[PDB]
Amino acid sequence: EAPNQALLRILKETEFKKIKVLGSGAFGTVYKGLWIPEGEKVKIPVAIKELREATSPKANKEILDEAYVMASVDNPHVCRLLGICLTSTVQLITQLMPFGCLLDYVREHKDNIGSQYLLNWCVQIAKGMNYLEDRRLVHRDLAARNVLVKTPQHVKITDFGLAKLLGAEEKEYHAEGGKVPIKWMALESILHRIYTHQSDVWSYGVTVWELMTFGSKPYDGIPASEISSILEKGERLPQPPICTIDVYMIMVKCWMIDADSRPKFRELIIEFSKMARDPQRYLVIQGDDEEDMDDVVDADEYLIPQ
């Protein structure tokens, strides 16, 4: 189809100063850090991710696939790649989402997260995903853990290690084995390994459930082998306490067997927008940096021709 004219930026290692670990994942460490472009005279907070440590040609392939996808997106609700650095090991460098991921965030702040935020974030994720849909791009790993907090009023979708572009105007993506987050997967993704924009919807349904239960674990207790069945019998996640039937009703729809019966991300945006206009009618909740930051700027503010 259309030619992908994204500009992958190569970055010198002298161009940015690492400052601390944020996630020494088994798969690879992720750092906080600063980037000071060529001679631009601006510093930009960034997250830096290198494939664990050792360079195994096998691993290198995937980190770059992420770099590829992440460099091909440009929307206020999706995390974009700033560029890569080809030192001994490959690094992905992107804008810093200071507050970490949304999951941890709700857990850490239950007693202060109001309805306005919950629905507002539900809107922002619906937007990000709708963007990816437009870019014919299936995420395959939508979850609360993979949404990052820029500010409490601004979340963006990240982690494209499993995304997939759709070519030859094909609809359902057939994939391999490996490690897949079952609890967030659509039924088709579990039985036929079929993935699609509409299976992303399902994962969205579970993501919205996460945020509404303040960070609970889906099907907690249960074990993934067990899952496919259950879901098969007809069982779905329960209605979260703070949830009106209206909201839970939208969650259930992202979980219907007939994948074309679920809502499109563009409808989910509309529906949540309405609700966000009167957040108290839809959610019932009890009670509703160490530098010459003189030249510090934020990615979303640093742009280059395009």
Ligand X SMILES: CCN1CCN(Cc2ccc(-c3cc4c(N[C@H](C)c5ccccc5)ncnc4[nH]3)cc2)CC1
Instruction: Kindly state the tokens that stand for 203.
Output: 């994962």
**Chain residue whose CB lies nearest ligand X:** 100
Please report how close the Cβ of residue 161 comes to ligand X at its closest, in angstroms. Answer: 8
* First and final C-alpha spacing in the chain: 20
* CB distance 195 to 140 below 8 Å: yes
Length of the chain equals 306
- In the bound state with ligand X, the residue whose beta carbon lies nearer, of 29 and 239, is 29
Please report how close the Cβ of residue 261 comes to ligand X at its closest, in angstroms. Answer: 32
Among 19, 89, 100, 288, binds ligand X (CB under 6 A): 100
- Element (H or E) spanning 68, and its range? helix 57-71
Report which residue type is found at 172: E
Please report how close the Cβ of residue 231 comes to ligand X at its closest, in angstroms. Answer: 28
122 binds ligand X per the rule CB under 6 A: no
CA distance 44 to 299: 6
> Considering only 94-102, 131-139, 169-177, 252-260, which stretch makes contact with ligand X by CB under 6 A?
94-102
Among 30, 34, 36, 59, binds ligand X (CB under 6 A): 30
14 belongs to an annotated ligand binding site: no
DSSP-assigned letter for residue 171: -
Among 44, 63, 96, 206, binds ligand X (CB under 6 A): 96
> Which residues are CB-neighbours of 186 under 8 A, at least 6 positions away?
195, 198, 199, 201, 202, 203, 259
203 binds ligand X per the rule CB under 6 A: no
CA distance 83 to 92: 7
- In the bound state with ligand X, the residue whose beta carbon lies nearer, of 135 and 156, is 156
141 binds ligand X per the rule CB under 6 A: no
Q: How far is CA 162 from the centre of its chain?
A: 11
* CB distance 95 to 110 below 8 Å: no
65 binds ligand X per the rule CB under 6 A: no
Residue whose tokens read 């906080």? 32
Is 200 among the residues known to form the active site? no
275 binds ligand X per the rule CB under 6 A: no
Catalytic residue among 141, 278, 295, 300: 141
Instruction: Kindly state the tokens that stand for 124.
Output: 């922002």
Contact residues toward ligand X (CB under 6 A) are 22-23, 30, 47, 49, 79, 92, 94, 96-97, 100, 104, 108, 148, 158-159
- Positions marked catalytic: 141
